[model samples]
Target: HMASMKKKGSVVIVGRINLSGDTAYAQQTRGEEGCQETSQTGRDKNQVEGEVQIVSTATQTFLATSINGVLWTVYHGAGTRTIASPKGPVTQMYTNVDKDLVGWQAPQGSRSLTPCTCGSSDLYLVTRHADVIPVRRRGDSRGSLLSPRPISYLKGSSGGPLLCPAGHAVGIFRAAVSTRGVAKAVDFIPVESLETTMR
Candidate 1:
């Protein structure tokens, strides 16, 4: 049950809170082997590093598993810096250049550091509106390398979670690609690589 109300401005009402903005990715320094240091930008007190995207209305959930306080999310673009999450401030831990994935470390006491299990099938993408969109694996794409499927009406909502049917997170949502003005596909960084990198 979702609706919009008006007072001084339009306010949306929902069972849970959803995230907004491309605020966290500060800068990226790519090296021959991998990234060296990706930092976060300084911001006003009111600003947040990043927000959590609720995976399900029923659960009112957002899934982010951390290993040693480090969590993984989609790299927004190059020139990256610090990553902020709803949990707490996250610093760059590792960047998988091949998969366009970056790992972040939250400070101790920020949140629990639990690794999420990888998924094989029945993947679901959580949207900004708290709506879940079903996605299928299209094998591997030519240039993308990663196997992300095309989804409709996605914008500025990259870095969200891509949930596996097992109810665990398998990937982080990347930017949506387009042919002309039409959205053709959305990419994601696979969980296997993140798992290996964390180890």
Candidate 2:
């Protein structure tokens, strides 16, 4: 059917565009329940999703192909290779290594890094960045075991893992410093500190 109005009247329209948070929320809820919407989210949401992952507590070692090596190297563990490591795009392989990675005494003054990631602690991801300044803080008075060297800024060490000597899993390489650089990655929170938040 077709029809026309009697008088020439005027009309108005109003609406609001979704902001950044709105779009993120919409995309996050997509495959859940009733999540149909007016428009699809943008591609940026996908990039953020790819950056996130679930890290484990205490025992799992995350092996990575560093910026210097073709084969997988020991990024985690007591005697981890740190000097000239290959960067990442890291992937986790959950195999066991508890037999060799032994627990040893905390070196010099690394007590401030306490609530050691071993034993019953789980590693939790806080955020990722590149070009962070790793420094040696005066942890408890034992001396200073950890020599916090800014691994990312040191080149060829981007996608690396921060592991314990015993092959216990800690954190992984996210980004590094290059122009072409990621952001403040050296910030490590306790794996045990975030165990409750993951759930």
Candidate 3:
């Protein structure tokens, strides 16, 4: 539950505490023939370095699992690879594992999806109130939100996290909507699914 002051820009009451962002992503790079490396060229090298995402109300990162749900990264700090175990193909949502605040999706258009829930344990959550998905605010026409952003999908962003206002938890990447200025996301399962998979 979040409350805003009459000033219209300040936040009064926030339900959770410091909601750290969790990165989620996968290897979208098209690898050439095995044993042969492609020449380092263009932003693809830096962009495709790895997949990443974040969680707003999630301080402790959990071991990720499953193929169609959101998994809490359970690990709070660095060295997560040593402790967290992934059930399926796991990827980081953003860069700067520690001390740095990355972007997440908060009510933004559908782009990517996650294996587990990010914020509240609700069934239809869709706000990036915290650090969950690499976010960017644009003033595009609401109509654009109706259709799937080709780049986000073709680039392997099926399980992307969407954020809400003021860096809050939101929803997972599902599909696009026709409401204009909005994108559809998926919520097949809760982020708590990794509890059993946690080490």
Candidate 4:
């Protein structure tokens, strides 16, 4: 049920961005569109270039990354296009796509977030622990614990849906925070954060 819920509105965006172009955007090409292609910075997993969700099929809107969200810095495969959500900030992109990109509608209401203990799930490791959204160790900020680490396929998994036990989406995957060569946890942009643009 957990994995099934995740696939409901998920999609992979095959696009390209020379983050260098963006890094140099402010310095070398301020007020201009010059996405650099000469420098090489290994792709940061946090950088967007892949997986995403169709959170609102009615408006054809979804979550995206600011890196690829830059209108001038990126180009996606033919047959699709994205527009910035009016309320979306540059880094946290809320974007809209074409109708052809829409799939099964994602549930409208989001579960109210709360701090959770990992042990709640007694059966299996569907997502983190027990379908409950985990809170940070330091305090009560909601996050995902993507146990055992999610990589490789994690490339496009960003922007994809992170569902709660109720089969409703909790957040859009941001990136996995890793430590000691192992992915520690998944940090996400809460769906609650997108309500403005979603409306």
On lDDT, the leading prediction is 1
Estimated TM-score per prediction?
0.51, 0.22, 0.24, 0.34
Window of ten residues with lowest summed lDDT in model 2: 9-18
In terms of lDDT, the poorest run of 10 residues in model 3 is 8-17
**Worst ten-residue run, lDDT, model 4?**
30-39
Q: Which is the winner by lDDT between candidate 1 and candidate 2?
A: 1
Between candidates 2 and 4, the one scoring higher on lDDT is 4
Candidate 1 lDDT over residue span 1-199, tens digit each: 2367521210001112232342222211122111111112211122212224211112122233333455554443321334433333334677766776665554333332233454355566665545566766554321121334344446534555666565465566665667765554556665555667877
Better of 1 and 2 by TM-score: 1
Best by TM-score: 1
Q: How far in Å is the alpha carbon of 84 misplaced in model 4?
A: 15
RMSD of each: 14.8, 21.7, 19.5, 17.9
Q: Ranking by TM-score, best first? A: 1, 4, 3, 2
Model 2 lDDT tens row, 1-199: 2366332111000011112242211113122211111111111111112121211112332222111111122223313311110121122222113211211111121111212345432222212222222322121211111332343433333223343433343443323322344332233322332222222
Candidate 3 on 79-184: residue-level lDDT in tens? 2321111111123343233321112112111122333334332232222222233333232101123234333332222233334343332332323332343343
Go through the candidates in order and give each one's C-alpha lDDT.
0.42, 0.23, 0.25, 0.29
Report how far off residue 84 is in candidate 2 (Å): 30
Shift in Å, residue 64, candidate 2: 11
Off by over 4 Å in 1: 1-68, 83-90, 107-119, 140-152, 177-180
lDDT order, best first, reads: 1, 4, 3, 2
Better of 2 and 3 by lDDT: 3
What does the lDDT read for residue 149 in candidate 1? 37
